Design a protein around this ligand. Structure first.
Ligand SMILES: Nc1ncnc2c1ncn2[C@@H]1O[C@H](COP(=O)(O)OP(=O)(O)O)[C@@H](O)[C@H]1O
Ligand SMILES: [Mg+2]
Lengths: 225, 229
């Protein structure tokens, strides 16, 4: 009865927040659908215009961001409820191997100087895997020729350091580095989701000067005790 | 053992809400960029081709979306905190301060507030801050829109509490009786807005309705279920 009342109250709060997001999406998509209908009618008729193609593609990009809001929000629930103990080397082995392949295809190099060990972590494996994958792919794009990935552990947590030889980053640019949600280079995700996912696992992220000349991204995650 | 597990639930759900609030704030900020590119494309098209019913329509839809994004940005900046913790509370203790502050506000405005049917010690279960702000918002709206007076009535039965807020204002047209609760509604502050009032009431398994008031203006009805031990 009371355990049941607590479970019902928690779900009721979660569902009402999801209904509000969903209702915000329905309102935004009312003018967007009218706009997409107007565009389609014009495009079907006066069909060869760079401006009309631009309006359609931007309307679709706006629509994808709204879809991201709904998908990524229902998914942040999954990270909260779906958690397990995992070892750092088993968690990120595939990401580091796929990144080494991506580096090779690009004509760049990835060096894992300090490899991960069987260090226990607690959280959502998919979210922690994609957070490192995102920063590593960011280094693969920004780097001139090389990227380096280092793992360190102490009694309290795991430090992941991602370095690149990309252009020197200004302290101002470094301070706002985790602010963009989308990649400026739908749209691919920027580094805001990385900070979000890491803070959700009670860790932190920092942007610093890299010894290789480019950007240094530092992830800290607590050890599972 | 069970406490540690239950507290691990609540704190994980608290971290989830922090990340969902950040996500809403982030995406709200990103929406403007394709919209301005779309508005530039529309402005250019109007120069190249002439006046068009379709182009004029795209333009009025892009402006409506711009207003909604402005409103979504303000909504994303004023998100509520500690929304998870629930407790048993009595209706009179919950809303006493709101009704007293409203009586003072009415006096300052040169208007009158009458609580004809006062709240009793009726048990509710949920978030006090959300339930308090929900009534505060509808009462502060009645104060703002009323011509001279507002009335607040509380009724209880075996299943729930009915709160009726009346004003002698211009009211709300039948066409917008449900529309005023939609995010970003505008006719074209007193609080977080009517969409956030309906969310707070529906999370407590209640409902809100807009009706004709015997006072001539708007009647807002809130229904909330009783907490049953
Ligand atoms: N008591 C009322 N009388 C008349 N109109 C009302 C009343 N309460 C709300 N409304 C209408 O509903 C709209 C949405 O309400 P609300 O979200 O609380 O305020 P806001 O104007 O800040 O968006 C108001 O702008 C107004 O047009
Ligand atoms: Mg108002």
């Amino acid at each position: 009865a009371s355990f049941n009342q607590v479970v019902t109250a928690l779900e009721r709060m979660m569902t009402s927040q999801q209904r509000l997001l969903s209702d915000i999406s329905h309102e935004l998509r009312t003018p967007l659908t009218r706009l997409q209908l107007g565009t389609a009618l014009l495009r079907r008729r006066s069909g060869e215009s760079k401006e009309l193609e631009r309006i359609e593609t931007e309307a679709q990009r706006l629509d994808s961001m709204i879809n991201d809001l709904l998908v990524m929000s229902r998914n942040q629930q999954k990270n909260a409820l779906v958690s397990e103990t995992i070892k750092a080397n088993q968690l990120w082995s595939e990401v580091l191997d796929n990144a080494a392949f991506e580096a090779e295809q690009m004509g760049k190099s990835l060096t894992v100087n300090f490899p991960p060990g069987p260090w226990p972590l607690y959280g959502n494996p998919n979210a922690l895997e994609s957070a490192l994958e995102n920063i590593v792919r960011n280094a693969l794009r920004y780097s001139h020729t090389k990227i380096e990935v280092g793992f360190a552990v102490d009694k309290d947590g795991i430090t992941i350091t991602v370095d690149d030889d990309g252009p020197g980053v200004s302290p101002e640019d470094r301070e706002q580095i985790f602010r963009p949600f989308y990649r400026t280079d739908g749209t691919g995700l920027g580094l805001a989701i990385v900070e979000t996912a890491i803070q959700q696992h009670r860790g932190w992220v920092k942007a610093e000067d890299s010894p290789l000349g480019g950007l240094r991204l530092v992830i800290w995650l607590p050890l599972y005790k």
